Paper text:
The third variable (V3) loop on the human immunodeficiency virus 1 (HIV-1) envelope glycoprotein trimer is indispensable for virus cell entry. Upon CD4 receptor engagement, the Env trimer relaxes the conformational shielding to expose the coreceptor binding site including the protruding flexible V3 for interaction with either C-C chemokine receptor type 5 (CCR5) or C-X-C chemokine receptor type 4 (CXCR4) coreceptors. DARPins are small binding proteins (14–18 kDa) designed based on a consensus derived from naturally occurring ankyrin repeats. Broadly neutralizing DARPins (bnDs) bound V3 solely on open envelope and recognized a four-turn amphipathic α-helix in the carboxy-terminal half of V3 (amino acids 314–324), which we termed ‘αV3C’.
Crystals of bnD.8 and bnD.9 in complex with linear BF520 and BG505 V3 peptides diffracted to a resolution of 1.22 Å and 1.17 Å, respectively, enabling a detailed analysis of the DARPin–V3 interface and definition of contact residues. Strikingly, in both the crystal structures and the cryo-EM structure, V3 formed a distinct, highly similar secondary structure when complexed with the bnDs: a four-turn α-helix extending from residues G314 to I323. In both the complex with bnD.8 and the complex with bnD.9, one face of the α-helix, including the 312GPG314 turn, was buried in the DARPin binding groove. The DARPins interacted, via their variable, randomized repeat regions, with αV3C. The binding interface accessed by DARPins comprised residues bridging almost the entire C-terminal half of V3. The most buried residues include P313, G314, A316, F317, T320 and I323. Both bnD.8 and bnD.9 binding are facilitated by several hydrogen bonds with most relevant sites shared; for both DARPins, T320V3 interacted with DARPin residues D67 and N/R69 (bnD.8/9), and G314V3 bonded with DARPin residue D104. Bonds between D321V3 and A316V3 with DARPins W46/R80 and S102, respectively, are unique in bnD.8, whereas Y318V3 with K113 and I323V3 with Y13 are unique to bnD.9. T320 forms two hydrogen bonds with bnD.8 and bnD.9 that seem to be critical for bnD docking, as identified escape mutations fail to form hydrogen bonds with the DARPins. Two escape sites, A316 and I323, are buried deep in the hydrophobic interface, rendering replacement by bulkier residues prone to disruption of the contact surface.
Numbering used by the authors:
A (entry chain B): 309 to 330
B (entry chain A): 3 to 160
């Protein structure tokens, strides 16, 4: 739920969303 | 609805329920608000048998979510080697860019998954690919102290 910027940003964004419904 | 339950079944490893839902007419390519499909969620959580069932029943191997993330990105990033192999055999785009310009090879290099890097390279991954931050997979390996992956990418680039 911290915002990872730069390389991997898209991945971390989706990885966090999936973590919500998981 | 059946699509919501299939997304839940796929992320939670419910092999039996995935088959029950697809028998009862669930859309194998059901997408949530965020563009995520059952195959994304099974690939993310390492549910190999579900990935195989979904692909067998018409799942879109190259589905991207709102961040351009494909099932292969998620399996590569999350270290699910057998899933990477199955997704590539089914026609996953090995060089898909997400909205950061990261490829599966960038994410495997960043996340320290060496056998996944090797399989991606074997299937035509672009070693020279630069994300939107100007990084190659080699650069992300170096940045993350993944020296084995950095060495393998330097050889591939030669």
């Amino acid at each position: 739920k911290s915002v990872h910027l730069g390389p991997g940003q898209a991945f971390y964004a989706t990885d966090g969303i999936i973590g919500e419904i998981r | 609805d059946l699509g919501k339950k299939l997304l839940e079944a796929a992320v939670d490893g419910q092999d039996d329920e995935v088959r029950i839902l697809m028998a009862n007419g669930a859309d194998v390519n059901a997408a949530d608000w965020w563009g995520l499909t059952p195959l994304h969620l099974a690939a993310w959580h390492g549910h190999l048998e579900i990935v195989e069932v979904l692909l067998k029943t018409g799942a879109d191997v190259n589905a991207s979510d709102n961040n351009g993330i494909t099932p292969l990105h998620l399996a590569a990033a999350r270290g699910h080697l057998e899933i990477v192999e199955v997704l590539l055999k089914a026609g996953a785009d090995v060089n898909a860019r997400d909205t950061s310009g990261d490829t599966p090879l960038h994410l495997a290099a960043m996340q320290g998954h060496l056998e996944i890097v090797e399989v991606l390279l074997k299937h035509g991954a672009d070693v020279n690919a630069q994300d939107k931050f100007g990084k190659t997979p080699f650069d992300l390996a170096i940045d993350n102290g993944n020296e084995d992956i950095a060495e393998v990418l330097q050889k591939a680039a030669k």
